[PDB]
Coordinates of C-alpha atoms and ligand atoms in Angstrom, one line a residue:
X12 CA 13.6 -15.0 -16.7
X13 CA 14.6 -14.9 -12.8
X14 CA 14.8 -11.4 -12.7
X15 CA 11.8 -9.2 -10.7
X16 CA 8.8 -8.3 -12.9
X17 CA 5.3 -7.4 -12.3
X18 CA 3.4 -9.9 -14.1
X19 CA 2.0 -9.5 -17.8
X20 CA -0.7 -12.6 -19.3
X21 CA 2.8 -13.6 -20.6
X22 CA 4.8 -14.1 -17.4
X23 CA 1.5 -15.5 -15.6
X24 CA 2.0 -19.0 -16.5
X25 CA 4.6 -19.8 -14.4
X26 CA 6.4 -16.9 -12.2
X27 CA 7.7 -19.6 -9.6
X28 CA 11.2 -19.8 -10.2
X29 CA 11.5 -15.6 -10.0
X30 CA 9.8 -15.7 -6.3
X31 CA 12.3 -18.7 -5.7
X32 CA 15.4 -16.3 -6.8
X33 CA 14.0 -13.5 -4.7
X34 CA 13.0 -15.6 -1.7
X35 CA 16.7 -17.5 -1.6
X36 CA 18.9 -14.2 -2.8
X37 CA 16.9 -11.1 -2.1
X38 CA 14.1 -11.3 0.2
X39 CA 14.0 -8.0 0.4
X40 CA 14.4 -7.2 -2.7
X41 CA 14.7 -3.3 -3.6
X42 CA 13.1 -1.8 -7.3
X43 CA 14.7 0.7 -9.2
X44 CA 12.5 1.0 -12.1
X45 CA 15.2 2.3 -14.7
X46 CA 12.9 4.6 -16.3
X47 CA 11.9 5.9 -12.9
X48 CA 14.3 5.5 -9.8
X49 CA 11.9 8.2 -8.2
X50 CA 9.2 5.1 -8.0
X51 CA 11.2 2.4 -6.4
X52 CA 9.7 0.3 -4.0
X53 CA 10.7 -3.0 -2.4
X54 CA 9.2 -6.4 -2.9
X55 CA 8.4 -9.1 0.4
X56 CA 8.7 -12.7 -0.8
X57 CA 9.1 -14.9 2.0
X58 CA 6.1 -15.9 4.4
X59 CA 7.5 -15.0 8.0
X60 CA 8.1 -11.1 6.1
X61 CA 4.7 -11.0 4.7
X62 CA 2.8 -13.1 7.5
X63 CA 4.2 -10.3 10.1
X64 CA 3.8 -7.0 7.3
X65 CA -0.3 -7.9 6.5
X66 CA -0.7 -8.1 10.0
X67 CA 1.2 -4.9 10.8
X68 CA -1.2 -2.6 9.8
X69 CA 1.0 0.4 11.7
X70 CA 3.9 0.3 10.0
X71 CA 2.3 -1.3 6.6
X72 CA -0.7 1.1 5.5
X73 CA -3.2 0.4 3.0
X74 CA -4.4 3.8 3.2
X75 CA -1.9 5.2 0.2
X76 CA -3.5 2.3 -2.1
X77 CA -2.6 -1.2 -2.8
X78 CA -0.5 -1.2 -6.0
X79 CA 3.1 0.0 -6.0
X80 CA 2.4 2.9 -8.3
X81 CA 3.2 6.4 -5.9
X82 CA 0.1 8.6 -6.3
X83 CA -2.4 6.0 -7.3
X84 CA -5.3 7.3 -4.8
X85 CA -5.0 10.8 -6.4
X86 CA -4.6 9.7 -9.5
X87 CA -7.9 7.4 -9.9
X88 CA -9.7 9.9 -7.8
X89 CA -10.3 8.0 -4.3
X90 CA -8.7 10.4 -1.3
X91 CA -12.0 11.7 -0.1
X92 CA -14.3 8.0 -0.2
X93 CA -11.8 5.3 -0.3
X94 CA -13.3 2.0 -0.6
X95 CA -12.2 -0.2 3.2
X96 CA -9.7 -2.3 1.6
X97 CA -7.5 0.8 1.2
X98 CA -8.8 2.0 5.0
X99 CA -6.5 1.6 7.9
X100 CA -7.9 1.0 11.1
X101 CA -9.4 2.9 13.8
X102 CA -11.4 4.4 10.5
X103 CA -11.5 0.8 9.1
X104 CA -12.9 -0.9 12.4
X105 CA -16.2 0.7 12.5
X106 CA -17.4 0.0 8.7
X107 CA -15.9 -3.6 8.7
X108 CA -18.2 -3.9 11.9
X109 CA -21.2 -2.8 10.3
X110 CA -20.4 -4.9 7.0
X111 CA -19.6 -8.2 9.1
X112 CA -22.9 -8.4 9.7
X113 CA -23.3 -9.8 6.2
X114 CA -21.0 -12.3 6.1
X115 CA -22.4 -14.8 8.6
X116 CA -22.9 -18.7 8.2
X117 CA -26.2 -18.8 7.1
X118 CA -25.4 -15.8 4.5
X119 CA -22.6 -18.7 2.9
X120 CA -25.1 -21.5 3.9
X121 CA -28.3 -19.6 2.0
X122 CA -26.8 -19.8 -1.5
X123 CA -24.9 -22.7 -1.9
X124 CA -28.2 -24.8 -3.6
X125 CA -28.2 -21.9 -6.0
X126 CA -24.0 -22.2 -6.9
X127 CA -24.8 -25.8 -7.0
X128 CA -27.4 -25.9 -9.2
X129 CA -25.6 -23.3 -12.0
X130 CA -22.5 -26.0 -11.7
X131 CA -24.4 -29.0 -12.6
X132 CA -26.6 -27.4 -15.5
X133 CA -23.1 -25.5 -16.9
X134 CA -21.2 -29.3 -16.4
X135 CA -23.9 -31.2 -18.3
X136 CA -24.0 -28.3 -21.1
X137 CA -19.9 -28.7 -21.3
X138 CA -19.9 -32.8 -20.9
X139 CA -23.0 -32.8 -23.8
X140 CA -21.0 -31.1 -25.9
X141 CA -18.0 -33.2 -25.3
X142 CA -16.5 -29.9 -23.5
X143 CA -15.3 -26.2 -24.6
X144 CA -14.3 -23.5 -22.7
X145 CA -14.7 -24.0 -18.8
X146 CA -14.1 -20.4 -17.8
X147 CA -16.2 -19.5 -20.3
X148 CA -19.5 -21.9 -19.4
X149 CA -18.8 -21.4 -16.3
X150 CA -15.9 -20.2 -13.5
X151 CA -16.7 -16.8 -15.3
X152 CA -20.1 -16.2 -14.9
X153 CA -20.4 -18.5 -11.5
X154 CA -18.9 -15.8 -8.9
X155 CA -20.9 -13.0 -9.9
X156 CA -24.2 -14.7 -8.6
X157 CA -22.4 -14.8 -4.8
X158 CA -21.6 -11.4 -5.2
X159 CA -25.3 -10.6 -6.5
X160 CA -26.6 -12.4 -3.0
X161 CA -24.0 -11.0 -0.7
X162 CA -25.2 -7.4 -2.0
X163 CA -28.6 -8.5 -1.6
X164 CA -29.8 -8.2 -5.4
X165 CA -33.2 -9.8 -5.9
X166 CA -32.2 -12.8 -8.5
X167 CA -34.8 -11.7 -11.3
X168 CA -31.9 -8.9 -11.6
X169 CA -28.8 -11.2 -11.9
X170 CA -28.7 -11.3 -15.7
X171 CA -28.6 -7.5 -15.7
X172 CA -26.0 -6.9 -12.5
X173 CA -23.7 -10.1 -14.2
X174 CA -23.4 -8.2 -17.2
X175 CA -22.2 -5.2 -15.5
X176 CA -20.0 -7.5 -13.3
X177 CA -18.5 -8.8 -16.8
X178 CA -17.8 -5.4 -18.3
X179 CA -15.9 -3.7 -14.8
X180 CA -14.0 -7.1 -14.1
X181 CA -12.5 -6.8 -17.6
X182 CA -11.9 -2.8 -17.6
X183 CA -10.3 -3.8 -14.2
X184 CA -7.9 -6.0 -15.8
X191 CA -13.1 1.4 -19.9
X192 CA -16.6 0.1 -18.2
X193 CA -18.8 3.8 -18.2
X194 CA -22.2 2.2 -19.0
X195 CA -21.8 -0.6 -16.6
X196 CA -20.3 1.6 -13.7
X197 CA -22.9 4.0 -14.4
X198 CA -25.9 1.1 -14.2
X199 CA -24.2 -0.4 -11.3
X200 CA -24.5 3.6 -9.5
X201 CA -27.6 3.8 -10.1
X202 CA -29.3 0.3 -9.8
X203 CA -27.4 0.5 -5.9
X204 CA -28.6 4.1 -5.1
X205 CA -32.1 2.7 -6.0
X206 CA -31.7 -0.9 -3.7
X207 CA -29.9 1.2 -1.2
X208 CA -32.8 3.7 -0.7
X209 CA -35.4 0.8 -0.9
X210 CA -33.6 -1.1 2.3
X211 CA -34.5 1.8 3.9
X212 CA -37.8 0.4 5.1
X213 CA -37.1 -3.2 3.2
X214 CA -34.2 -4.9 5.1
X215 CA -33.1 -8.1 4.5
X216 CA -29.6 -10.1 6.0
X217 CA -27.1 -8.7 3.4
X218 CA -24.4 -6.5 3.8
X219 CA -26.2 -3.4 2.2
X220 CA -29.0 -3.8 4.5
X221 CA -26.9 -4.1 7.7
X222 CA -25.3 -0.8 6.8
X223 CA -28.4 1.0 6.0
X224 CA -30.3 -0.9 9.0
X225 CA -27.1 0.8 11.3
X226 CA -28.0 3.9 9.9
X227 CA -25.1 4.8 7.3
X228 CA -26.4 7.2 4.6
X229 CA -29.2 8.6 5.8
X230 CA -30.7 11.9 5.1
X231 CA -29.7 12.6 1.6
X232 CA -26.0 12.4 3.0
X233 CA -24.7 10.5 1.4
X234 CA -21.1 10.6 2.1
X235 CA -22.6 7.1 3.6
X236 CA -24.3 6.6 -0.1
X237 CA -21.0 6.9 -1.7
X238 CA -19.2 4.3 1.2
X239 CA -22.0 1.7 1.2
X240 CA -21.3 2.3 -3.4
X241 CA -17.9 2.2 -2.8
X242 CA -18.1 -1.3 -0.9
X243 CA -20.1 -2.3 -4.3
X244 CA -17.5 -1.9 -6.0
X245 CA -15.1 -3.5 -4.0
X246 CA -17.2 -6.8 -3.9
X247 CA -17.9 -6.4 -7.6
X248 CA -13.7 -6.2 -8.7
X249 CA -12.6 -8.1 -5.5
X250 CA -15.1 -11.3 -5.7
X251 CA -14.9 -11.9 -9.3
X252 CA -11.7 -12.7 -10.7
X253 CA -10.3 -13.8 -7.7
X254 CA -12.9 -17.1 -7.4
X255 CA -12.3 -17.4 -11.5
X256 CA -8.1 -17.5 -10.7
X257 CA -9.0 -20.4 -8.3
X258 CA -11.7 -22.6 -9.9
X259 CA -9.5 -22.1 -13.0
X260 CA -5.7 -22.4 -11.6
X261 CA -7.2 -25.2 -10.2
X262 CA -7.8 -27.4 -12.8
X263 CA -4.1 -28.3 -14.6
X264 CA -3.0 -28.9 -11.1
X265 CA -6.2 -31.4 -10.8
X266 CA -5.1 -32.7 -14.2
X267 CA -1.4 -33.0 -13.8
X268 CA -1.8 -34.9 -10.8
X269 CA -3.9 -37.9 -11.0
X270 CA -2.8 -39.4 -7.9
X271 CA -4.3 -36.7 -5.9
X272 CA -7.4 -36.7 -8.3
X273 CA -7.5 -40.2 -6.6
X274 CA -7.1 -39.4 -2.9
X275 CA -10.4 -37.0 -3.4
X276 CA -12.1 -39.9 -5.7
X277 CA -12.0 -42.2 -3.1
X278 CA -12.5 -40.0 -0.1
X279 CA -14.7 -37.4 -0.8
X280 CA -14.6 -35.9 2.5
X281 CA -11.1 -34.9 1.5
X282 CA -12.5 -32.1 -0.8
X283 CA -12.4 -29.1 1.9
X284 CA -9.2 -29.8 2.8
X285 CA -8.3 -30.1 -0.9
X286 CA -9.8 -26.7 -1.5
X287 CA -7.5 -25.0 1.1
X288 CA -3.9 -26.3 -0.7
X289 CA -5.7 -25.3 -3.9
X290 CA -6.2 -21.7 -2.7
X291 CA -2.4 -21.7 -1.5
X292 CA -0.9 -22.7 -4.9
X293 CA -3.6 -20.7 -6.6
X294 CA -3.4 -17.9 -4.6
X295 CA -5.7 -15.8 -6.7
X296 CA -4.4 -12.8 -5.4
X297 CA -0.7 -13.5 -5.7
X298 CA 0.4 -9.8 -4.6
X299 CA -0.9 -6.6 -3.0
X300 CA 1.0 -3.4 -1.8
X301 CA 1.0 -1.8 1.4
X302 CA 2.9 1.8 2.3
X303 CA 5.7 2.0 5.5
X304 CA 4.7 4.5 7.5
X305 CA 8.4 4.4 9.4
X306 CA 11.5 2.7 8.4
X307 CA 11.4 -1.1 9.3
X308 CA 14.8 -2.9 9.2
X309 CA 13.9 -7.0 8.0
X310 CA 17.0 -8.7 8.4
X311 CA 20.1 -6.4 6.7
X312 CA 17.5 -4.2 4.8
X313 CA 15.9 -1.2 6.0
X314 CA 13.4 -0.1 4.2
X315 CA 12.7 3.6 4.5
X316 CA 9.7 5.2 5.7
X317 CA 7.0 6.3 2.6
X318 CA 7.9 3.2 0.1
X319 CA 5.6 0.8 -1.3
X320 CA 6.1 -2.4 0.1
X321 CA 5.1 -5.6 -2.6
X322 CA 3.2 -8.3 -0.3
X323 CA 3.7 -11.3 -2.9
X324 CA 1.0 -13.2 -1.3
X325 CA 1.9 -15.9 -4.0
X326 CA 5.6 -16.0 -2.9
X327 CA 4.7 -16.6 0.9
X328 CA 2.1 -19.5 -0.3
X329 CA 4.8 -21.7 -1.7
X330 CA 7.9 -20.1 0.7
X331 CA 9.7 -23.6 1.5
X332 CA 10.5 -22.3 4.8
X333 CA 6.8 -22.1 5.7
X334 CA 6.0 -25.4 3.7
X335 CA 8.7 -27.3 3.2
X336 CA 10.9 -28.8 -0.3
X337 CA 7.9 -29.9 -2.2
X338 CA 6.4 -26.5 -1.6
X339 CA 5.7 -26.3 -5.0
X340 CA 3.9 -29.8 -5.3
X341 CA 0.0 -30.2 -4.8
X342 CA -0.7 -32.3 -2.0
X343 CA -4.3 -32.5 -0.9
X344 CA -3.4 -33.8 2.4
X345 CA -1.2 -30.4 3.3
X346 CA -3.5 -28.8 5.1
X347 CA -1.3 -25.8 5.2
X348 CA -1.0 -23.2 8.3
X349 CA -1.7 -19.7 8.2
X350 CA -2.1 -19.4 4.1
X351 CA -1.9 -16.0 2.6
X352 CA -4.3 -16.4 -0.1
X353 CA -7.0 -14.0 2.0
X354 CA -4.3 -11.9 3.5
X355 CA -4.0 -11.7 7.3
X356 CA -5.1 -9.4 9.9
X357 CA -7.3 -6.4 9.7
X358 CA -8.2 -7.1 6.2
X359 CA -8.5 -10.6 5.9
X360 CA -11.2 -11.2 3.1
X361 CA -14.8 -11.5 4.4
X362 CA -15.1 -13.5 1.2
X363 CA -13.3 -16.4 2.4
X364 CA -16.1 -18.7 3.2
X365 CA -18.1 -17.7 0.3
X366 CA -15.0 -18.3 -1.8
X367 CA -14.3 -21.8 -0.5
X368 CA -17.1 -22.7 -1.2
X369 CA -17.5 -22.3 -4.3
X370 CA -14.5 -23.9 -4.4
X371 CA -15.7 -27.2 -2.8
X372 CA -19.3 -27.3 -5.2
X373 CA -17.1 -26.8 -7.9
X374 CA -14.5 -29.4 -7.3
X375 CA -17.3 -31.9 -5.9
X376 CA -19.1 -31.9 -9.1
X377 CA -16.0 -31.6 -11.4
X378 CA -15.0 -35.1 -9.9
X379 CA -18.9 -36.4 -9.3
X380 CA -19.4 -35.6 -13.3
X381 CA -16.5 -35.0 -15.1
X382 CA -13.9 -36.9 -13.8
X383 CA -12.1 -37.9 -17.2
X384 CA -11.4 -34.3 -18.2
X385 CA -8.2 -33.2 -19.7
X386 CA -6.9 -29.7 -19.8
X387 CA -3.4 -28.0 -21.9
X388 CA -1.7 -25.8 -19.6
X389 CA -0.1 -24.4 -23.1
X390 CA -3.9 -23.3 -24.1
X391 CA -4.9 -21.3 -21.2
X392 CA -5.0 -17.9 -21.6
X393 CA -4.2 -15.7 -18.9
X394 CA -5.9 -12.6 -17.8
X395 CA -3.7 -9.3 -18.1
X396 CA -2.4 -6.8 -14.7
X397 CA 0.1 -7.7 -12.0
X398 CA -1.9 -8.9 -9.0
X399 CA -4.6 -11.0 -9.4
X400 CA -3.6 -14.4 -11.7
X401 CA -6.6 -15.4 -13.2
X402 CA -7.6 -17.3 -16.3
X403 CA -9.9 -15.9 -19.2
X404 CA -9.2 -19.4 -21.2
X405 CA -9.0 -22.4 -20.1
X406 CA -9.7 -25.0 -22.9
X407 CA -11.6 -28.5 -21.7
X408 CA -12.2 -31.8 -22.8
X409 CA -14.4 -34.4 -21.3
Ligands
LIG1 C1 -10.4 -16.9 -4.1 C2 -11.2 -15.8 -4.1 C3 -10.8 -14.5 -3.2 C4 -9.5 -14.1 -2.9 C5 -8.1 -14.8 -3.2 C6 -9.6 -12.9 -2.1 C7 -8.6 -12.3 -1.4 C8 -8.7 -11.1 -0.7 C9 -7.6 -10.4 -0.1 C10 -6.1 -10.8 -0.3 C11 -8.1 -9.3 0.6 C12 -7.4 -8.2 1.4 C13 -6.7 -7.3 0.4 C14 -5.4 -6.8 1.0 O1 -4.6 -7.6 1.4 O2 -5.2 -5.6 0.9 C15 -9.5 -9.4 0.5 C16 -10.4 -8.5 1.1 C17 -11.8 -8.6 0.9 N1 -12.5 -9.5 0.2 FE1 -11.8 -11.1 -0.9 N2 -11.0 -12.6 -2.0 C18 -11.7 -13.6 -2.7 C19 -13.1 -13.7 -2.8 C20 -14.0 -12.8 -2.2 C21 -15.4 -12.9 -2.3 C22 -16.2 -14.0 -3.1 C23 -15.9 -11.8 -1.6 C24 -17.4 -11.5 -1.4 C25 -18.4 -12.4 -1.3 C26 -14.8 -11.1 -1.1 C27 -14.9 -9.9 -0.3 C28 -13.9 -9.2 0.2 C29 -14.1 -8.0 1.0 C30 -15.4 -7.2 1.3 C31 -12.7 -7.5 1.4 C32 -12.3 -6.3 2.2 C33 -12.0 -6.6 3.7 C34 -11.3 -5.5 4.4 O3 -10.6 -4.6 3.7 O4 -11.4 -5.3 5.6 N3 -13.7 -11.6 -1.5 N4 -9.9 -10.5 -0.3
LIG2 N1 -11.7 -9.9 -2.7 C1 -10.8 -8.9 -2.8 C2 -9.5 -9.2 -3.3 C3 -8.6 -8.1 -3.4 C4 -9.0 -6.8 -3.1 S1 -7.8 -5.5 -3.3 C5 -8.8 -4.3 -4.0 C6 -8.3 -3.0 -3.9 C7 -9.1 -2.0 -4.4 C8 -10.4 -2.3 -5.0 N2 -11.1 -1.3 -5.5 C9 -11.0 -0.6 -6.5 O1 -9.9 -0.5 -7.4 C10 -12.1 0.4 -6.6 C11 -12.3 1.3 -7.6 C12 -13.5 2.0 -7.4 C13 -14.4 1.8 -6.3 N3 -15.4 2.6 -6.4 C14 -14.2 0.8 -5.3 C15 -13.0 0.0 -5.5 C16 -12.3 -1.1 -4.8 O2 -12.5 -1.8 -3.7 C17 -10.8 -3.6 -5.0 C18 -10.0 -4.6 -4.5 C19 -10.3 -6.5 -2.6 C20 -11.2 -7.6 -2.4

């Protein structure tokens, strides 16, 4: 099918040609859920539409939540400590600037030994064996060790906060226990940077005073932002190491390019994150009417920022927008949003990206994957493998 759907594990595999019908023949394309009119929304497909609506903060709010279900703050029980990524600025501005503070070069440059070293042990395990399953072994697991360091979580405790980390990602897609350990394992770190600080995140918003005094409105943000790096940092860096690797496979050529030229690799990792673009769609909620081209979308609707669409929009990128090319380096991706919210992940995530992909090609570079045997994660806006069967 052509026709607009949110996305199910089935549709996952290939929902290309439906942004190409809505980007040529209704770029702003209006919902009318059958069962409930009341809901519509509208759906943004081309880049120039979504470039200009992530960075229009005004007129596109995050405040109302980020999924195109009306009443969805209310409903999950958020209105009163809503996590930033569902902040609008001025509130936004001053938590982002405390948080920033953990998301610094040397906060990126700090852990990459550590990401390295789980790749190559979890790559000589798989080639050993002959292969098995590479999400499994290893883009699962990988992602929730950055997480662990950017929230400052002393590695003798990674085991423990990983299994948490498993049990929300996949209730995310239902995780009590694992919600309730993660509560209380941060309300205990969080009291103990009190007089301990270190360069995380956590620290930097305790250091700057937030949550003092059992008060805790502050407790609740700095748990809230917990959360949003644990279901945020996860799947998102498992959609793009595993995305990644039937468009490695199907594309020898390129394989090539990054054989022979190494130094290729970061620039690789950027077209990889616009055709994987982890996070193919978030919503956003007009807070006026806003006329794009002969459509005026009314004040009060969700707005569908397909992310995914813009990334391969062959007005931005050209015919062969669908085609990996390691040389692209494309402009302005959408893969981390833009503007106010940009992800403060994006460094953290390429690189990942780049250990990954060096020691894929370093060790494993006669690997072979089935597109038809991946297994794609459930929910409609984060495309992520759970499967990804791989030979070596
Ligand atoms: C490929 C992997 C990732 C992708 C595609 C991704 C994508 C995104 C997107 C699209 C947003 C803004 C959401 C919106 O538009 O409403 C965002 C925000 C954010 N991301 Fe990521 N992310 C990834 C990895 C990470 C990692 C590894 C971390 C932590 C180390 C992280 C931390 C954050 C945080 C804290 C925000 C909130 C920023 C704000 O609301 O001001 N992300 N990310
Ligand atoms: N890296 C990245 C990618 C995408 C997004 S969008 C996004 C939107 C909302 C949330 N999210 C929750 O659903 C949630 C539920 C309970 C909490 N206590 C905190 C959060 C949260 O951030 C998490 C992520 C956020 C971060």
């Amino acid at each position: 099918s052509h026709e607009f759907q949110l996305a199910t594990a089935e549709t996952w595999p290939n929902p290309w040609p439906m942004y190409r019908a809505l980007r040529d023949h209704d770029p702003v394309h209006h919902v009318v859920p059958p069962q409930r009119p009341e809901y519509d929304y509208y759906v943004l497909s081309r880049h120039a539409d979504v470039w200009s609506a992530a960075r229009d903060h005004q007129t596109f709010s995050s405040a109302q939540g980020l999924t195109v279900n009306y009443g969805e703050l209310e409903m999950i029980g958020l209105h009163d400590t809503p996590p930033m990524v569902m902040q609008d600025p001025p509130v936004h501005t001053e938590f982002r600037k405390l948080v920033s503070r953990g998301f610094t070069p040397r906060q990126v440059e700090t852990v990459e030994p550590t990401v390295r070293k789980f790749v190559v042990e979890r790559l000589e395990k798989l080639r050993a064996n002959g292969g098995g399953d590479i999400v499994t072994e290893l883009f699962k697991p990988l992602p929730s060790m950055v997480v662990a360091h950017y929230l400052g979580v002393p590695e003798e405790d990674w085991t423990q906060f990983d299994g948490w980390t498993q049990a929300i990602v996949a209730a995310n897609a239902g995780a009590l226990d694992a919600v309730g350990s993660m509560m209380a394992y941060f309300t205990g770190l969080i009291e103990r940077r009190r007089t301990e600080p270190a360069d995380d995140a956590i620290s930097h918003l305790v250091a700057a005073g937030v949550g003092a005094d059992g008060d805790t409105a502050g407790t609740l943000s700095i748990l809230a932002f917990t959360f949003t790096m644990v279901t945020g940092g996860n799947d998102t860096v498992t959609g793009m190491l595993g995305g990644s690797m039937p468009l490695l496979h199907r594309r020898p050529d390129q394989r090539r390019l990054l054989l022979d030229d190494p130094e290729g690799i970061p620039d690789a990792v950027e077209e990889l994150l616009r055709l994987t673009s982890p996070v193919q769609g978030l919503a956003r909620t007009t807070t006026r009417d806003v006329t794009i081209g002969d459509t005026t979308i009314p004040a009060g609707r969700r707005v569908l920022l397909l992310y995914g669409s813009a990334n391969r929009d062959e007005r931005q990128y050209g015919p062969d927008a669908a085609e990996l090319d390691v040389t692209r380096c494309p402009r302005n991706i959408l893969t981390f949003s833009h503007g106010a919210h940009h992800c403060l992940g994006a460094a953290a995530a390429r690189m990942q990206c780049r250990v990954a992909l060096t020691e894929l090609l370093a060790r494993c570079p006669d690997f072979e994957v089935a597109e038809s045997r991946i297994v794609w994660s459930g929910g409609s806006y984060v495309r992520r493998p759970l499967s990804v069967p791989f030979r070596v």
